[PDB]
Amino acid sequence: AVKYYTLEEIQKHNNSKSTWLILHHKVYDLTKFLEEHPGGEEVLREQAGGDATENFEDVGHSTDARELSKTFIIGELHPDDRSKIAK
Template sequence: MDNDKTSDGGVKFYTLEDVRVHNMINDTWLIIHDKVYDISKFLEEHPGGEEVLLEQGGADATESFEDVGHSSDAREMLQQYYIGELHVVRKVHFPHVLSAKKKCDLGVTCSLIKNDISFSYFYFAVSFLHVLANLSHFFLMKNLPHTHTQKKSMIA
């Protein structure tokens, strides 16, 4: 369903979900550089054919638009189909996840999905194993007979 939210300047804002439903031949919207365009009336006039536009209908077509290398005239013509802006929901980032690559030890490259909590469990497990290894080393060194002291007693 279309979003009727407007800013103080009268600009309409649409969510990605609003745009997605407009992907048919008689109702085609595109997003290009976070601007929303209703190109329904332009489909038949498009020099590359309507199929190209229909493939991108209801989605962000920025990359495809730029890959083609549209002329300044085409960019200017696009403005007549402008209907609003894409409402971008701010993402919440967790610092421990954003800096996760910096936290990886032993040259291990961590491939993470942002905000994936599984890294926290991984990092905890690695830290726990590190502590366990140090404790084991400490107790082994304390309880093993010292070979260098035995050699000295043999020499004397």
């Protein structure tokens, strides 16, 4: 069974103590990845707590980066919150 989180829940994880973001409806805990990310901490920091899909896609990310992202998945956006934000 898939763990869901709402937007309101995710929105709280917006700082160094706990940073989550959403990509393509998956929820990622990037708390430790922030200082590993090749693209730096501040671009993650600026989108913390919400959907970052467009920005992730707009800047481009390798296949290797997309495979790496799977390692930080902690759950999925609640179905009733999908109409807000795009997959």
